């Protein structure tokens, strides 16, 4: 269970071809305060779907 020949940097870049990160790009805008947040999450000031939630 060890290699007999060193793989190339071509094969190394081909293995990492699927290691790429999907960027989010789907940030929602709160309607009350106009803050950017994740979709289905609370804001940094703490609103969710218009009405006031937790704190801080």
């Amino acid at each position: 269970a060890v290699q007999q020949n060193k793989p190339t940097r071509s094969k190394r870049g081909m293995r990492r071809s699927h290691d790429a990160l999907t960027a989010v790009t789907s940030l929602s805008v709160d309607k009350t305060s106009g803050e950017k947040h994740l979709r289905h999450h609370i804001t940094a000031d703490g609103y969710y779907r218009g009405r006031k939630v937790i704190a801080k």
């Binding site: 994740l38 999450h41 609370i42 939630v53």
Partner: protein
């Protein structure tokens, strides 16, 4: 496989799940809003909400059955004295899940679980 089976194992045995659900149910009855991970916030519904359903109707046997669970006199006092007659008309859905991003140490998806009204 897992066909039609309910209940998160939560990387624990049954004893630790029962004690941790007991402590987290006591913390949610006490503070009325707590912050935990999202699968634990979803398994906490199935633990906390039958206690409020049990505490709709006050009796000695319902109090000793709510003390067989949750093991605290102050928690069962708040169940049968406050949370019972506030949720007496609401038929289920005694609590609310609100996702709040992630956690700094392990990227755990966090969630606030709270009661519906909270009187705050």
């Amino acid at each position: 496989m897992r066909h039609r089976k309910s209940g998160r194992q939560l990387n624990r045995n049954s004893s630790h799940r029962q004690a941790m659900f007991r402590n987290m149910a006591g913390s949610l009855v006490r503070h009325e809003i707590i912050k935990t991970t999202l699968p634990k916030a979803k398994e906490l519904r199935r633990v906390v909400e039958p206690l409020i359903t049990l505490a709709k109707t006050d009796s000695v046997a319902n109090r000793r059955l709510a003390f067989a669970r949750t093991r605290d006199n102050e928690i069962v006092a708040k169940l049968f004295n406050e949370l019972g007659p506030r949720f007496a008309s609401r038929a289920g859905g005694y609590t609310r899940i609100l996702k709040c991003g992630f956690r700094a140490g392990d990227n755990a998806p966090m969630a606030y679980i709270e009661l519906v009204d909270r009187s705050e």
